[PDB]
Amino acid sequence: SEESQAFQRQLTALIGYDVTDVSNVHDDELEFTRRGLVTPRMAEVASRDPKLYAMHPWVTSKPLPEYLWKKIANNCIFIVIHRSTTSQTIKVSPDDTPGAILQSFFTKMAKDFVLRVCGRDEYLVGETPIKNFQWVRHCLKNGEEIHVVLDTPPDPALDEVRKEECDRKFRVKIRGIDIPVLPRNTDLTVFVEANIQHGQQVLCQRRTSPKPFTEEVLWNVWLEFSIKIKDLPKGALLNLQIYCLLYYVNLLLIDHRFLLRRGEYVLHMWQISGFNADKLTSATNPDKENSMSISILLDNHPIARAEMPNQLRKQLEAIIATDPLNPLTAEDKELLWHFRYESLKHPKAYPKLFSSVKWGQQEIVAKTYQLLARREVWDQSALDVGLTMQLLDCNFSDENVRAIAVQKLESLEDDDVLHYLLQLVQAVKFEPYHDSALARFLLKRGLRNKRIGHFLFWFLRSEIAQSRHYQQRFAVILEAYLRGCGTAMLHDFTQQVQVIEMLQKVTLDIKSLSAEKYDVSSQVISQLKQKLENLQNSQLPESFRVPYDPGLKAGALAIEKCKVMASKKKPLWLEFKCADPTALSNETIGIIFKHGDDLRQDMLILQILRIMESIWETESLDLCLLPYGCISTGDKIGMIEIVKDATTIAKIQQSTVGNTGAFKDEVLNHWLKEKSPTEEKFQAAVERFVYSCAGYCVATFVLGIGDRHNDNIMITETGNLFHIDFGHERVPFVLTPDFLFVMGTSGKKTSPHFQKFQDICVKAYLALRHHTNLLIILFSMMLMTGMPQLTSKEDIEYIRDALTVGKNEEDAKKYFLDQIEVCRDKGWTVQFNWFLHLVL
């Protein structure tokens, strides 16, 4: 139909890639998948409650932590309801529902509707004990009053959805390589390596002979693999590689229809930058012009008791106990396999067990499947996310293994889904096939809830715009989403996209106009001011959802407040008015637009920071981290939330002390005193400081991103410290002397506030260690799916030592309390060292 052709144009500009394009394809997986995703979408689109969907109450079922009970010191909670500009305060108990507040409010006003948060597309509707709304817990945490406007349900009709309706050795032939142009070196050596791979396990490996490197190289050979054909497991990849390692490509041996892949192939290959999730994609390089290729033939047909000695069970359990990064011995593996049934009784053994499987042997895979049908124990154990993540990583390519993980996720409530979304999305990179339990889990959840839907979009779009290796897959999932999210939401994404394409334009042009000489010359403030007033009228939408806080609808530029940093990269600092007239305040929405850093990295780190916070909640800690909004929009470009009322420790050192790397120790306290209206808010600032410092000291050590310059650390006027710019002699973390004179210490001393700081770290630290497995897998996934290129040992195995795996609680505290001492030891050594190696 005519309409649907133009609607596809829509989808394409929203997505930033064209999924009807079939230029870069050698089979029909993507298309089969676009058609596969229809059912599960229409399903959830058929399933959701239109009313609750439209208002998307952000809700939890977690208990309220202790640090916020000490804030309702009376089983009573105040709510300021507004009408036009008339208002009154209501007496409410934590457990009261949104329903049981209306019936009370109209028994509180004598001579149906819906409550909504002031200045936000946010609502308190539905049957949950209002102590269980996030916006409420946010007010408490930050000492705030809960303001609401009385309006109706947003018409549940506004999310109207548009309607739709055997026993031979495997053999492979290397014809040869081609590269149209390759003057890449004085010539060395070149051979081809064909690996049969399952879950990063090399099942089998044959090579070619070493020739010199010409723009055209031939062999015409059958490589005989040891594996029989009947023995290939679904999702095995034939993995093809060129060493002189220079190029790679991958072909799924078995297709999405369980068919043995037969025939002729010309595969355009990816280059290593002159281990890593890109190394894994089944996608061929779409740049058919410059790219190396390879030509192959496939002529080869679908797919076909309790007794235990003590010393073994002890060895078994010792193996099962150990961390996710401890290597399994061959003996270890045979132990797990032969006692697979005793192993099945322990959820925690699943990763190790399934990685003890000889996947290149058919009758064993078959035994593994028969095993997976005794899933009573797995099905009935509580949901361990770190367990579940492990089964979704690069080590498992089996469909059924992976499905039992996706099973466990189903019981996740939106609140938690949102905590893991980013990493669940990156985890699609490890799926063998475009259609998977996990890709479909993401749809479902995303379509069931607007908050997850929104983040689903930007997370998927972030990679679509930026990586060739996975743009196609993600673009099919993204497509599938947009076709379900409903008319309203499409409208928002549409104007969200237009605003950021516009503002990036401006970001790039401004960056071009200034030299290495960083000044912000009157001439550049000229350019910026003018560009924005031009944009303000006939181009820039009236208002837009702030991508990283979908509650906030942003309005007009505050042109006078927009500026540019005095820096080699030249980021915009942009500020916006709030489209919502019911907004309680008049404070601007701040967004930094920046080109230069890989913000994908920032996204990953930031989101672990939240996970960490949530981990701390489980033990009633609060460490006042400030994980500001950050989104990758495309290649080394993106946006960042402006944190209001903060500067850099560096600037606080430029102010009173000067600028040639000079350093003095009292200034932090001076600055803090001077930004506190009463010496009491000041107290609250020192207290903010001790807690926020401590948090970042711990988080930062665990992730090994703690050796930072002061210019990359910030504080709010209310004492909230926070690390920034996760761009990319040593020291564990940053506990400088200037920080210390706020603790009350002078190199040696130990004041009630310092004792406190040491207290809180140890508390925070060995609390992360209670979640060790989770953090290890997250970190390891982070590394593989979001960094430069990282070693299958040295890099990942940093976090083992940091979380001091294997150690008793006792050593652990001792270990951390000494890291502190290395800071106490060196003070300003490395800080100053930045400007030392300005010229060396």
Ligand SMILES: COc1ccccc1-n1c(CSc2ncnc3[nH]cnc23)nc2cccc(Cl)c2c1=O
């Ligand atoms: C208050 O902003 C600063 C104070 C001292 C040193 C640097 C900054 N700063 C910074 C500090 S980094 C930062 N990082 C994350 N969230 C933030 N909110 C406010 N600043 C940040 N970023 C800028 C980005 C674009 C344009 C400008 Cl003009 C700035 C900028 O001035």
